[PDB]
Amino acid sequence: VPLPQLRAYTVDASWLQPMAPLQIADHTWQIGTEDLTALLVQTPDGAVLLDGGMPQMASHLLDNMKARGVTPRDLRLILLSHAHACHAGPVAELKRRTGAKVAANAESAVLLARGGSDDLHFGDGITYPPANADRIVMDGEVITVGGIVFTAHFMAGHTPGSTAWTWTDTRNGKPVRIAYADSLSAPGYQLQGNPRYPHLIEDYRRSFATVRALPCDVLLTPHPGASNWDYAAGARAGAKALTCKAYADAAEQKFDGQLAKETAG
Amino acid sequence: VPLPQLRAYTVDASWLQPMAPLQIADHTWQIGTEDLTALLVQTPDGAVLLDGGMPQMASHLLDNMKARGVTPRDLRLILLSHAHACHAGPVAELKRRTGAKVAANAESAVLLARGGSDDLHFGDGITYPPANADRIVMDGEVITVGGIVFTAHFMAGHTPGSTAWTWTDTRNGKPVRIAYADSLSAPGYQLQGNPRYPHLIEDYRRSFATVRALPCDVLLTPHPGASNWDYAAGARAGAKALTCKAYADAAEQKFDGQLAKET
Amino acid sequence: VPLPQLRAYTVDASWLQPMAPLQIADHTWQIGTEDLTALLVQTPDGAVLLDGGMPQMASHLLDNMKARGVTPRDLRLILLSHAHACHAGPVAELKRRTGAKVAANAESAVLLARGGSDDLHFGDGITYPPANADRIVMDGEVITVGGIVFTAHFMAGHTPGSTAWTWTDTRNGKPVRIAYADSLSAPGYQLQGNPRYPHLIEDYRRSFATVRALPCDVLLTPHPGASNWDYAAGARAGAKALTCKAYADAAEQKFDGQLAKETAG
Amino acid sequence: PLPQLRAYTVDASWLQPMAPLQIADHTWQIGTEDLTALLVQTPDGAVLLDGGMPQMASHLLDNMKARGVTPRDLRLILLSHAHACHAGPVAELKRRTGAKVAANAESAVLLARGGSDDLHFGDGITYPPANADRIVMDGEVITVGGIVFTAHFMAGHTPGSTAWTWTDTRNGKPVRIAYADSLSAPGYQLQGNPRYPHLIEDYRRSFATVRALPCDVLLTPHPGASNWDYAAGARAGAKALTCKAYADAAEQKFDGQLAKETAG
Ligand SMILES: [Mg+2]
Ligand SMILES: [Mg+2]
Ligand SMILES: [Zn+2]
Ligand SMILES: [Zn+2]
Ligand SMILES: [Zn+2]
Ligand SMILES: [Zn+2]
Ligand SMILES: [Zn+2]
Ligand SMILES: [Zn+2]
Ligand SMILES: [Zn+2]
Ligand SMILES: [Zn+2]
Ligand SMILES: [Zn+2]
């Protein structure tokens, strides 16, 4: 009886299906894959990347940036929703290949630095190349790049360091408040009496409320399907996109269902 | 004109006056200096150290451990109230010289790893040797060593990673609920509109309430004066020590006055 | 066509075949798998582990330690030949589950801390959970545990941080000088004009000489086949083992052939 | 009673700000009168080799501004060795600029612990820790614009001590600049040092390495070691040592120290 072979983080093909840049607002573009969000915000003072998707997505991201007129040197900042392999995957490589520095909260920083290992729920099941944060941010802290202001909103649950980022762009000669809210799922998590996360339920409850109150004209999520985006649909990608309020409400209802099932017995 | 010389974190003499171990309960001892707390909890499964004081206290702590019958190998765990120089100072050296591993929350861990540099309020004024945390703890998480159970209570404010640790020891044939609550001070802090700590006020207010509600037969604090301990007085050191409620009340009062003067 | 799926570090079944502790000398035991070395060296003051094999080997190592009378508290030190996945794999987990601290040279420490990512030759193909070194060692430095003294001998090549560890144990009332020499292979490596490792050839050449000159009654290697050990043969496991000289000479030959092939190509 | 914490107090000249002093077409001394901090500026970004003391961060930034180098323009930080008097402001510079650090493994580990647990100084000279972004190997090259930097390991003063070499121009001719690290062993236990068993061997190799460097112009982290006088402006390098003279002087001093140690 040999030990099991290691398994890589294999995923649905659509998570790895490359797409051309899709314009969300005047300065904001979806540059990831059909089923994983990676947002490029272009400012007069360099570019900002929010999430990168999977580890093998680095070169694709760089190719899309080039199409947008962004050189590796132009990329100044990487922000993250949470430090799982399907969102922070290519961060280490992007840091080696670009001028980009990472800003994240302490919880996301520590998970990123250990490459997603010793996950509270997944253990070492979903690892990726580790990276160091260049700046630690606090809840409500702002970062300004080229007159565009990004605000962090902590929403602990999916991971302890789960974060929503908000900024104001423009579209059709009008300000548009963009909310990139993190995942609110608890996929296979032990919810009550979890020794690794004693206040998990309380944190999720606060996070549902936080997501509801976000400045949110346009909502996007790390997994686009969670906010009902269809990136493959092009110009009508966000035709049926959920609001922050509807997103949180659906998430809490799922959560409540899971909590009920767990209580038996 | 030459740039100013660097300035060291210079402290009151009493913070640097060694003392012999002072018994708090059957397994819990104050082993730091007269004016800085360092708590040794001795179990049949090894020893736990809560805070180490200043960087220069490492050898003294080891002297006191040996006096208590705890070898460098016997020290298993280091816990921290917060990662300032006056409490986490000797952690790196203790890690090199003992079997000890550090458990801390993410905020304390990142501050520890940068040796207290780029402090939200103090800049680089209070640096110390950096150290890596061996285990990251979440709010309410328990750590059991030799049948003694330590519980973490996050109380953000003084630092983002400020933590209270509680455990039950025995004294006089009865259980004693010990609370090692962190500093609730905001010394010279900008409280409102602080870009480095936007929700400082909310965190402090939650922390006052957390401390007030702690399981707390005996309160100890990293700076013993904050809870009215006098370690140099020996047997009557904690005779007039504050309750957790009194400690939080005084802290909130001081905070409220500071906030009023700022607005 | 989507981006390629991630590929796991899959290995020969024999690398993952657990074995019971095999005694090498009075205080030195092989406790890994049939085809990956993990050495337990015991003293009255605690135990040392030299290498752990693959990431999935953690629980097996702990079980074998238990069988040898080494509790998690008794494991004091982890040393490494080199920080590849097939030798440092379970180090992070062992640190979490035991009192063990890691001592390694700066090169090995930096590779361990990035979990084998950005490997000079393998890129991100062989990643594992990252870990921090607790102590940095210099060439020729000794570490004493109980009455046993371990000496580091730097032998850069296979990795920049490649190290041989030597100590003296006993067998049949007599001292036995054990040499745990690191790998001297260059599997698929670009040898000449490698921008990531300009002095690769020079380092290997000095390393062949270093291995040749080690205090060496008993040679052991991270991959037992390299020193002609057969861990499945029990009492006769080391009956056909190579000397340090023979091991270095064969490795230099192989290397010379590889260099000639590269030069021709 | 226990002693107070120590601050790294230094000679006034080490903290004496100076305006940028041109060494060659791309290369400027931008530190203080008695601590080297070299700025190399290209159309594809600037490189800083050493920063001096921790309190020098704002001064370096002011001098960069004077040279037309914005915080965003600063791409790379290289180090001679990771002591407080050279890597001091690195953490702050990383926070305030786009700069990333390239260093060898030895320098990276020392930098990450802010100079603490020094092989010889213990915790006597500490500074704010920083992480390296790129690990370099011996002989590795880094290209920024038209400038090519080559690393030459010269272990001794610290395990990670490195010389950096590049070719600039001066009056229509190539000038091979060698920024050689310290070859001093101040108060060091040389023989039988358990923390550095092969110290003597490494130093002797390092003297030879420095002697052989491509070296039209030598600069050193402590400029006095190579007989530079930065305060003298246009005359600063008029009596600068060759790489050979620098290495020879260092070896003679080292030999003297070893003799004294063996005798005592
Ligand atoms: Mg026992
Ligand atoms: Mg002068
Ligand atoms: Zn996730
Ligand atoms: Zn995900
Ligand atoms: Zn404090
Ligand atoms: Zn304090
Ligand atoms: Zn290998
Ligand atoms: Zn291997
Ligand atoms: Zn040029
Ligand atoms: Zn120095
Ligand atoms: Zn110096």
Helix (H, G, I), strand (E, B) or coil at D150: strand
Tell me which amino acid residue C241 is. Answer: A
Instruction: Give the ligand whose atoms come closest to the C-alpha of residue A53.
Output: 4
Q: How far apart are CA D31 and CA D64, in angstroms?
A: 10
CB C173 within 8 A of CB C237: no
Largest Cα separation within chain C, whole Å, is: 67
Interface with chain A: mutation pick from B105, B108, B110, highest number of A CBs within 10 Å: B110
Residues 6+ apart with CB under 8 A from D133: A95, A96, D100, D101, D102
**Preceding-residue numbers of gaps in chain D (C–N over 2.5 Å):** none
Chains that touch A (3 or more CB pairs under 8 A): B, C, D
- Helices A200-212 and A244-263: crossing angle in degrees, nearest 10, is 160
CB D98 within 8 A of CB D65: no
Helices (H) and strands (E) in chain D, counts: 6, 12
Domain of residue B179 covers 1-263
Method: X-ray
Q: Which residue of B has its CA nearest to D118?
A: B129
Cα C56 to middle of ligand 10, angstroms: 43
Helix (H, G, I), strand (E, B) or coil at A211: helix
Interface with chain B: mutation pick from A82, A105, A108, A110, highest number of B CBs within 10 Å: A110
Closest CA to D179 of D38, D2, D70: D38
Instruction: Give the ligand whose atoms come closest to the C-alpha of residue D24.
Output: 9
Which residue carries 């220069």 as its tokens?
A: B56
Residues 6+ apart with CB under 8 A from B110: A106, A109, A110, A136, B161
Tell me which amino acid residue C101 is. Answer: K
CB D119 within 8 A of CB D195: yes
Which residue carries 């460097």 as its tokens?
A: D213
CB C40 within 8 A of CB C62: no
DSSP label at A131?
A: -
Residues 99-158 (D) with a CB less than 8 A from some CB of C: 105-106, 108-109, 119, 135, 137-141
Cα D129 to middle of ligand 2, angstroms: 30
Q: How far apart are CA A117 and CA A130, in angstroms?
A: 9
Cα A99 to middle of ligand 4, angstroms: 25
CA atoms within 13 A on the CB side of B22: 22
Chains that touch D (3 or more CB pairs under 8 A): A, B, C
Q: How far apart are CA D28 and CA D40, in angstroms?
A: 7
Inform me whether the C-beta atom of residue B196 falls under 8 Å from chain D C-beta atoms: no
Inform me whether the C-beta atom of residue A213 falls under 8 Å from chain B C-beta atoms: no
Cβ–Cβ of B2/D9 closer than 8 Å? no
Residue C203 tokens read as 């380092």
Residue A17 tokens read as 């299906």
CB B76 within 8 A of CB B99: yes
Cβ–Cβ of D194/C136 closer than 8 Å? no
Q: How far apart are CA C138 and CA C144, in angstroms?
A: 14
Q: How far apart are CA D173 and CA D189, in angstroms?
A: 44
Closest CA to B220 of B81, B75, B47, B76: B81
Q: How far apart are CA A22 and CA A229, in angstroms?
A: 12
Task: Give Cα separations from C7 to A11, C125, C126 (angstroms).
Answer: 12, 8, 9
Residues paired with residue A85 on neighbouring β-strands, in sequence order: none
CA atoms within 13 A on the CB side of C104: 31
Helix (H, G, I), strand (E, B) or coil at A200: helix
CB B104 within 8 A of CB B80: yes
On the 0-12 / 13-18 / 19+ scale of CB atoms within 10 A, B138 is buried
Helix (H, G, I), strand (E, B) or coil at D47: strand
Q: How far apart are CA B78 and CA B87, in angstroms?
A: 11
Which residue carries 């922070």 as its tokens?
A: A88
Q: Which residue of C has its CA nearest to D197?
A: C140
Largest Cα separation within chain A, whole Å, is: 66
Instruction: Give the ligand whose atoms come closest to the C-alpha of residue C119.
Output: 7
Task: Give Cα separations from B53 to A150, B38, B57, B94, B166 (angstroms).
Answer: 38, 6, 7, 12, 19
Residue C27 tokens read as 């205080």
Interface with chain B: mutation pick from C43, C71, C73, highest number of B CBs within 10 Å: C73
The region that residue A188 occupies, defined by phi over 0 for left and psi between -120 and 50 for alpha, beta otherwise, is left
Run of H or E including A254: helix A244-263
Chain A nearest C-alpha distance from B126 (Å): 18
Please give the radius of gyration of chain D, using alpha carbons only, rounded to the nearest integer.
Answer: 18
Q: How far apart are CA B227 and CA B230, in angstroms?
A: 9
User: Closest partner residue to D137 among C106, C136, C196, by Cβ?
Assistant: C196
Chains that touch C (3 or more CB pairs under 8 A): A, B, D
Inform me whether the C-beta atom of residue C71 falls under 8 Å from chain B C-beta atoms: no
Q: How far apart are CA A89 and CA A85, in angstroms?
A: 4
Cβ–Cβ of D15/B33 closer than 8 Å? no
On the 0-12 / 13-18 / 19+ scale of CB atoms within 10 A, D67 is middle
Inform me whether the C-beta atom of residue B76 falls under 8 Å from chain C C-beta atoms: yes
Chain D nearest C-alpha distance from C79 (Å): 17
Chain A nearest C-alpha distance from B136 (Å): 9
Residues 6+ apart with CB under 8 A from A74: A46, A47, A65, A99
Task: Give Cα separations from A174 to A41, C127, D127, D173 (angstroms).
Answer: 17, 47, 49, 57
CB C31 within 8 A of CB C64: yes
Question: What phi and psi, each to the nearest 5 degrees, are found at residue D94?
Answer: -65, -35
Residues paired with residue D221 on neighbouring β-strands, in sequence order: none
Residues paired with residue B165 on neighbouring β-strands, in sequence order: B152, B180
Hey, what's the torsion of the CAs at B147, B152, B158, B161, to 10 degrees?
110
Q: How far apart are CA B246 and CA C193, in angstroms?
A: 71
Cα D228 to middle of ligand 2, angstroms: 9
- Helices B244-262 and B200-212: crossing angle in degrees, nearest 10, is 160
Q: Which residue of C has its CA nearest to D139?
A: C198
Cα C79 to middle of ligand 8, angstroms: 15
Cβ–Cβ of B96/C46 closer than 8 Å? no
Residues paired with residue C28 on neighbouring β-strands, in sequence order: C25, C41
Residues paired with residue B176 on neighbouring β-strands, in sequence order: B169
What is the DSSP secondary-structure string of C209-257? Answer: HHHHTS--SEEE-SSGGGGT--GGGGGGTTTTPPPHHHHHHHHHHHHHH
Q: Distance between alpha carbon C126 and the CA centroid of its chain, in Å?
A: 16
Residue A200 tokens read as 């998990």
Run of H or E including D200: helix D199-211
Residue B78 tokens read as 């280091």
Cβ–Cβ of B129/D112 closer than 8 Å? no
Closest CA to C162 of C196, C210, C117, C198: C210
Q: How far apart are CA D263 and CA D258, in angstroms?
A: 8
Cα D50 to middle of ligand 10, angstroms: 12
Q: How far apart are CA C80 and CA A197, in angstroms?
A: 33
Question: What phi and psi, each to the nearest 5 degrees, are found at residue D150?
Answer: -120, 130
Residues 6+ apart with CB under 8 A from D30: D18, D20, D21, D37, D38, D39, D48, D60, D63, D64, D67
State the resolution, in angstroms.
1.8
Cβ–Cβ of D7/B4 closer than 8 Å? no
Q: Distance between alpha carbon A111 and the CA centroid of its chain, in Å?
A: 14
The sign of the dihedral angle between the CA atoms of D81, D86, D92, D98 is negative
DSSP label at D122?
A: B
Going across the sheet that includes B101-104, the strands are B22-25, B28-30, B39-43, B46-50, B75-79, B101-104, B135-136
Provide the pairing of β-strand D21-22 with C218-220.
unpaired
Cβ–Cβ of B4/D128 closer than 8 Å? no
Task: Give Cα separations from D110 to C109, D83, D119 (angstroms).
Answer: 12, 8, 10
Task: Give Cα separations from C220 to B73, C161, C255 (angstroms).
Answer: 30, 18, 20
Q: How far apart are CA A43 and CA A171, in angstroms?
A: 15
What is the DSSP secondary-structure string of chain C? Answer: -PPPPP------GGGG-B---EEEETTEEE-SBTTB--EEEEETTEEEEE--BSGGGHHHHHHHHHHTT--TTTEEEEE-S--SHHHHTTHHHHHHHSS-EEEE-HHHHHHHHTTT-SBTTTBTTT-------SEE--TT-EEEETTEEEEEEE--SSSTT-EEEEEEEEETTEEEEEEEPPP---TT---SS-TT-TTHHHHHHHHHHHHHTS--SEEE-SSGGGGT--GGGGGGTTTTPPPHHHHHHHHHHHHHHHHHHHHH-
Tell me which amino acid residue A69 is. Answer: G
Q: How far apart are CA B122 and CA D101, in angstroms?
A: 25
Q: Which residue of B has its CA nearest to C145?
A: B73
Helix (H, G, I), strand (E, B) or coil at D225: helix
Run of H or E including A65: helix A58-67
Q: Which residue of B has its CA nearest to C92?
A: B134
Closest CA to A237 of A65, A25, A11: A25
CB A126 within 8 A of CB A103: no
| Cβ-based contacts of A134 with chain D (< 8 Å) | 94-95
Question: What phi and psi, each to the nearest 5 degrees, are found at residue B28?
Answer: -120, 125
Residues paired with residue D143 on neighbouring β-strands, in sequence order: D148
Helix (H, G, I), strand (E, B) or coil at D134: strand
Closest CA to D163 of D102, D112, D122, D206: D206
Q: How far apart are CA D151 and CA D214, in angstroms?
A: 12
Instruction: Give the ligand whose atoms come closest to the C-alpha of residue B120.
Output: 5
User: Closest partner residue to B134 among C45, C73, C95, by Cβ?
Assistant: C95
User: Closest partner residue to A18 among C3, C5, C129, by Cβ?
Assistant: C3
Hey, what's the torsion of the CAs at C228, C230, C231, C233, to 10 degrees?
-150
Chain D nearest C-alpha distance from B214 (Å): 34
Residue B24 tokens read as 């708090």
Residue D134 tokens read as 């790129």
Q: How far apart are CA D203 and CA D184, in angstroms?
A: 9
SS (H, E, C) chain B: CCCCCCCCCCCCHHHHCECCCEEEECCEEECCECCECCEEEEECCEEEEECCECHHHHHHHHHHHHHCCCCHHHEEEEECCCCCHHHHCCHHHHHHHCCCEEEECHHHHHHHHCCCCCECCCECCCCCCCCCCCEECCCCCEEEECCEEEEEEECCCCCCCCEEEEEEEEECCEEEEEEECCCCCCCCCCCCCCCCCCCHHHHHHHHHHHHHCCCCCEEECCCHHHHCCCHHHHHHCCCCCCCHHHHHHHHHHHHHHHHHHHC
Q: Which runs of E-coded beta strand occur in D124-233?
A: 134-135, 141-144, 147-153, 162-170, 173-179, 217-219
Chain C nearest C-alpha distance from A115 (Å): 7
- Helices D105-112 and C106-113: crossing angle in degrees, nearest 10, is 70
Q: Distance between alpha carbon A262 and the CA centroid of its chain, in Å?
A: 27
What is the DSSP secondary-structure string of A76-105? Answer: EEEE-S--SHHHHTTHHHHHHHSS-EEEE-
Going across the sheet that includes A135-136, the strands are A22-23, A28-30, A39-43, A46-50, A75-79, A101-104, A135-136
Q: How far apart are CA B178 and CA B166, in angstroms?
A: 6
Largest Cα separation within chain B, whole Å, is: 67
Helix (H, G, I), strand (E, B) or coil at D80: coil
Tell me which amino acid residue C112 is. Answer: L
What is the DSSP secondary-structure string of D178-194? Answer: EEPPP---TT---SS-T
Cβ–Cβ of C132/B132 closer than 8 Å? yes
Closest CA to C167 of C138, C189, C144, C201: C144
The CATH code of the domain that includes D42 is 3.60.15.10
Q: How far apart are CA C54 and CA C39, in angstroms?
A: 14
Run of H or E including D20: none
When divided into structural domains, chain C yields a total of 1
Helix (H, G, I), strand (E, B) or coil at D74: strand
CB B49 within 8 A of CB B165: no
The sign of the dihedral angle between the CA atoms of B221, B224, B228, B230 is positive
CB pairs under 8 A between B and C: 18
Each residue of A161-197: b (16+ CB within 10 Å) or e?
bbbbbbbebebeeeebbbbbbbbbbbeebebeebeeb
The full length of chain B comes to 263
DSSP label at A208?
A: H
| Cβ-based contacts of C135 with chain B (< 8 Å) | 96
Peptide bond into A265 cis (omega under 30): yes
Which residue carries 């996050």 as its tokens?
A: B154
Chain C nearest C-alpha distance from D63 (Å): 33
CB A94 within 8 A of CB A38: no
Question: CA triplet B16, B18, B118: central angle to 5 degrees?
Answer: 35
